[PDB]
Design a protein around this ligand. Sequence first.
Ligand SMILES: Nc1ncnc2c1ncn2[C@@H]1O[C@H](COP(=O)(O)OP(=O)(O)OP(=O)(O)O)[C@@H](O)[C@H]1O
Ligand SMILES: Nc1ncnc2c1ncn2[C@@H]1O[C@H](COP(=O)(O)OP(=O)(O)O)[C@@H](O)[C@H]1O
Ligand SMILES: Nc1ncnc2c1ncn2[C@@H]1O[C@H](COP(=O)(O)OP(=O)(O)O)[C@@H](O)[C@H]1O
Ligand SMILES: Nc1ncnc2c1ncn2[C@@H]1O[C@H](COP(=O)(O)OP(=O)(O)O)[C@@H](O)[C@H]1O
Ligand SMILES: [Zn+2]
Ligand SMILES: [Zn+2]
Lengths: 716, 564, 183
Amino acid sequence: DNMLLVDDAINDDNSVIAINSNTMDKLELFRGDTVLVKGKKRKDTVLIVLIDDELEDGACRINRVVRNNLRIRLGDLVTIHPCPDIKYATRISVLPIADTIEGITGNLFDVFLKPYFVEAYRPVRKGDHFVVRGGMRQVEFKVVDVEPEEYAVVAQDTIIHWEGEPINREDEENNMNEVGYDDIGGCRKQMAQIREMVELPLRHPQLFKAIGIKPPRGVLMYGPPGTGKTLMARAVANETGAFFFLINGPEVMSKMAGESESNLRKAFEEAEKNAPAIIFIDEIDSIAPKRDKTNGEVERRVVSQLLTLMDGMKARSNVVVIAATNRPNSIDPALRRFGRFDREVDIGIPDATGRLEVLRIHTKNMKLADDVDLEALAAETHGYVGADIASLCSEAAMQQIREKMDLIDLDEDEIDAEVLDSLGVTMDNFRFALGNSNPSALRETVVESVNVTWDDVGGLDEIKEELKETVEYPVLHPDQYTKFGLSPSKGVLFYGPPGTGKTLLAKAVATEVSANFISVKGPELLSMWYGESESNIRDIFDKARAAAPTVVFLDELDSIAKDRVVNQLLTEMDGMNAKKNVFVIGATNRPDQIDPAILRPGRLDQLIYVPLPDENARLSILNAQLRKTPLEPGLELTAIAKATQGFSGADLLYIVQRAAKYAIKDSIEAHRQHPVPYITKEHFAEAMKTAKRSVSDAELRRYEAYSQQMKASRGQ
Amino acid sequence: TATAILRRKKRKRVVRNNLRINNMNEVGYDDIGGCRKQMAQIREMVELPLRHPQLFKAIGIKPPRGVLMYGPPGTGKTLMARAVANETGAFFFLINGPEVMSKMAGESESNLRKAFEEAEKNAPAIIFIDEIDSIAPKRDKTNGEVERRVVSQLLTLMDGMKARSNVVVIAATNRPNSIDPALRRFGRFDREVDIGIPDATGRLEVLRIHTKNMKLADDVDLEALAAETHGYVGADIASLCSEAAMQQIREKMDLIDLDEDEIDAEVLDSLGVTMDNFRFALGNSNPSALRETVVESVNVTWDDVGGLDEIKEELKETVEYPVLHPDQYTKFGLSPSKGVLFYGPPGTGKTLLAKAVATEVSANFISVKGPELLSMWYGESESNIRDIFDKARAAAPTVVFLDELDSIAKDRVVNQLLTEMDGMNAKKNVFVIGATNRPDQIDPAILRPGRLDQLIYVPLPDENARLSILNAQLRKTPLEPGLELTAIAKATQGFSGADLLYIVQRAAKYAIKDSIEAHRQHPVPYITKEHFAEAMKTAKRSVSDAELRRYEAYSQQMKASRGQ
Amino acid sequence: RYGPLRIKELAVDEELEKEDGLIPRQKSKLCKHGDRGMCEYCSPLPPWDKEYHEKNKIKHISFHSYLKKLNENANKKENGSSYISPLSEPDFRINKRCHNGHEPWPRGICSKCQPSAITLQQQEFRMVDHVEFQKSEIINEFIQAWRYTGMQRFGYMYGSYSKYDNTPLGIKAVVEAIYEPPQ
Ligand SMILES: Nc1ncnc2c1ncn2[C@@H]1O[C@H](COP(=O)(O)OP(=O)(O)OP(=O)(O)O)[C@@H](O)[C@H]1O
Ligand SMILES: Nc1ncnc2c1ncn2[C@@H]1O[C@H](COP(=O)(O)OP(=O)(O)O)[C@@H](O)[C@H]1O
Ligand SMILES: Nc1ncnc2c1ncn2[C@@H]1O[C@H](COP(=O)(O)OP(=O)(O)O)[C@@H](O)[C@H]1O
Ligand SMILES: Nc1ncnc2c1ncn2[C@@H]1O[C@H](COP(=O)(O)OP(=O)(O)O)[C@@H](O)[C@H]1O
Ligand SMILES: [Zn+2]
Ligand SMILES: [Zn+2]
């Protein structure tokens, strides 16, 4: 109906929009009528309607300036509404753009704007852009202020105040706030959570009045630093169009004694007095740290003031508080109960698709060369949070500049435009930047996503069936468990010789139910045991809960199951709600060494033996690990697999790696002498000659004895 | 006459609205449920001194003034305080803890001074110092000079208050031990009230109170939700209802166009919460009270446990008679026993025996799992043994179940427990029941007279007991018609209760597997005997012969040492 | 209001707010650096510098300079907040409408609508700096009234404000005539 299609207007007028006759009839509009046009990001403008039959029905023509102001592109949809109550601008105060006025002599206003508005009656709104073509020059301007507000018609008698200093252009670009969802990718789930928890309470209050509930107020986003928490909050606030009131932590805590509390009070009062509002308390951990941290009075008064303000806003006011912290345990525990930040959101490192989307978003203004395979970079970059990807792009650009520095004279302050034209990033620059990049997200426990299916694991059909019936059914068919009153199994414990691929089974199980996968290796467990780590078991399980359905994975658990840490783990496992879709998968190589308490019912009770791969499994592993390697045509791996009886997956990977090493050595030698694009069978034969099993026969016999003991324990 | 006060709006269509039949304060007693006893105590301690002061003039005594409520956060302490204050209709001065602590240095004492002075001038008055722990933490917790000035000012004001003036001071704090010890003496917060998590009926009352405005779909089973929610505090129930409504609106959002500020009236009027929404909200929700020791009632009788008739009679003689008939004990002058120690193979149902004993005497039940004991031993748990017994005293009568004593009694914690148990009032009904699978390893000092001296052996379930357990566990599950379990019970000689639970769970697992397979193919609503056979093929004993021999030898030695 | 409030005041305040008042300083003998670049002693002196005043025998800081100090101390540009207004006059009247659940003040008062203790302390900004009489006759005649009669007098004084260079961003009230009410 009113969703007129956007088109490039032939005319350059800043207050004219051409529409088809059919649409004009549909909306009862007419030529010369002033209407309010709304596009995207809630941007609005006032345009004079003109009939033009060339346009197809339902299409409207607008110029470049109006499209830029509305932040919409050609082919978009704009909603047109009547604007009959627009008054004539009593006084319009406008200043030009500095760059556009360089080299202009005489009075700019008389030269350019004086004929533009006289006998024009152009409706102007604050924050708009209008361009005037005078003589041989074209100058853009800004509608700084309009009286009456917020918009009005510039009549002949309207007084135009052009006095003032030039306005720099860089402000609009380098301050690119009002960023929409189009600048964020790879975090659709958390974005949807924040949207459903913020927009609906504000954009459609009547819903909760009809249902009759008090919508939740607090929201607590947390995750690794540099994952774009601030960007997400800013985007949501801008999309909602509410009275965003960013509050920083360091900014508040740097004030004189007796002033930070006043700033907090004034901020909350301002947000309340202009409802709706979205208070965003960035880096709340600096304002309200953990109790065992700083005990000073100045560090206590601020926390008490924040608690009082939080408890004081519980009313009809439409105020939403969003806080961002690195970890859930860093915040004072008093701020995570009812009436406070009771809803949590967890941000996790993106997957390959997320990294590709981030690369596309950042690398849209770069002068990229043709040889760009962004998919390749996304595949090769693992664990890179958004900040790491931005740094990678910057480093690649800098490397390109360095390479092209040969034709650059540092002493000369002038650079030929031709040289700047030749500038262009290449895949080599990106690979160099990847070589020099330093990711840091993985150094701490972090929620991630895995996409491994029942094809990277060879054999183990019975174990796969057991895992399916243990995990897949509870998540996908909870109704059946409710029907039969059977509580879902919490977790399972894998045991077997190292290298059998337990992590692969865990990742496959996580993928099948579409559950985020949390990993906790031995070093992290020991560091927590010694109390010199930045994360705690309570923190790990809080993140698992907030990111449900999750799958926690404990590796080489025997190192700690030899215990205060084990006590905390038991307490957390007892605490977790049964209905919550959180599964703890433990792995160890010496099952009898595990503390018996961990094996009691209601805990990691189910015990699963992971055997060594079979001949067919060996062949499958060899094929899987060699998928992206050039093999000699006609080569069959059946003989090699047969010769590798009793070899775990790690052994086969070692064999493949040695064969590739021989091949690359031969290729390097041949090139240096100046060939062998693939790997010949002789390389594999040499690798097998240099093979060695990783498990002694005695340990295998011990594992088999333990398995037989377990089977007899359940055999009758 | 436990209450004697509760038995008989808010001092107040148009007429009914005016008579009350964002600031809708003055919440009356109707807005509270599941805490009848605590509300009765608070009313008895607040109303009578103010509403009817002539009683104490006539009898010639000074009524108590200091009332201190403590319990898990979110149980509704502030709700009760405000309800009582508004119902009494007296000058109500409200002092927040953090709000007072947020003032500049030197301006946090003047507030207390003027508060108490005003309460005196406009008597009668009620002063509710919410979150007193923030303005009076433990002595060692805070050493800042201002933290001592404020506490000393509070103590001086409290001591000076004691006079004919009709002013009552009420304080709240989640942790009973957090408050400074000096605040719990004569002339100060002497009377103490403990808030416990509600029971099934209390949960239903809370659910009805909160879910009285939602456009609930006609297919709602609030009774089922009340039964399912175990350990849910009132705040948790409110969050559950809010999340269920959120889920309903999210499901309905498909027809709603977010672009338009307004929505079609018909859709807005079609909102309704269904049972599945409550199930989803329960799935998402996560209670927090159980992380720490709390007080909760139990309703297990001598029917959910099979056999153990002799042990049941022994427990009856130990616990029930003194509480129900203390007069005869006074006549004979023999004080009742303090504690009991259950020992035996794991999974025999010691916890069920403790809960049944607690229910018989209508006493509240406190539980302390083994991990809690270890955490207290390592000093990384907020609670403490002194706190446990303080809550047990405040909520008397009470049954404190110390489980897994072997972990600590393999000691600082054992010494603290011994001191606390020795200091227990003789006549106050505070029973301690200890559980341990290693009676030999337990520290002998705990077995001396005046302590957990009464040892009781808990044998493995008998054939009839196993049949009763199996019937009890499987009663709420759809089983095949004409299904026999006597054969399974007979075949399960020497199996512990946990083993029977495992067998039935395996049978249910096979049943659900077959049901899901049929659903995929398309059937199996019952648990056919073939499922039982399949499950039994795998399940097996969990107690070794040596363990049973050791337990029998220990019991026989105990019998020999107790008679000739 | 998403930014500075919109309201019209005297011309003196506007012109004062236009300026910056930075007091330039030259290379101190204590500087160790090239000609360009300034370390800590060659930087321009803010108009509210307390040392400069007490060294020049000026006792208060010329309110406009106080406003500059408050704006500098906070209100980062382009981000960090939404312009919390810097100045607010004291108000000690008890809020008759707070209602956390309590009733009006006469019969109920919480800890949120309780006027906290008031700490008197000598002010540091004087709004009007120099009062200036155009002609000594204005006050000479006023005193002449008492001279003739012997009784005391009292009169309002009319005039207008203007800039005052002698003090950083200072104001002077120039009085043109005196009017005597019936007393
Ligand atoms: N009978 C009830 N028991 C417990 N909570 C209830 C009950 N009825 C309603 N509620 C709700 O439970 C929550 C209790 O909040 P309240 O502030 O009283 O808790 P609290 O932890 O005791 O408070 P605080 O320590 O901050 O004073 C509120 O949502 C109240 O509406
Ligand atoms: N979709 C995105 N996800 C994550 N980071 C992003 C995304 N788009 C851009 N970024 C970049 O990641 C960084 C996010 O910073 P952020 O972690 O929010 O800062 P803060 O420490 O204040 O939370 C910025 O450099 C931003 O440009
Ligand atoms: N089906 C499989 N069976 C065994 N190992 C496999 C299989 N598929 C891949 N692998 C390899 O096994 C290795 C397992 O590494 P790791 O997790 O450190 O040991 P484990 O799996 O014994 O815990 C991986 O590096 C992987 O390449
Ligand atoms: N008469 C009974 N004897 C043994 N176990 C029972 C009996 N009745 C019920 N049970 C089961 O015993 C379990 C409780 O185990 P419990 O004996 O408390 O463990 P523990 O011995 O380690 O304290 C419950 O799951 C319940 O189903
Ligand atoms: Zn210098
Ligand atoms: Zn108030």
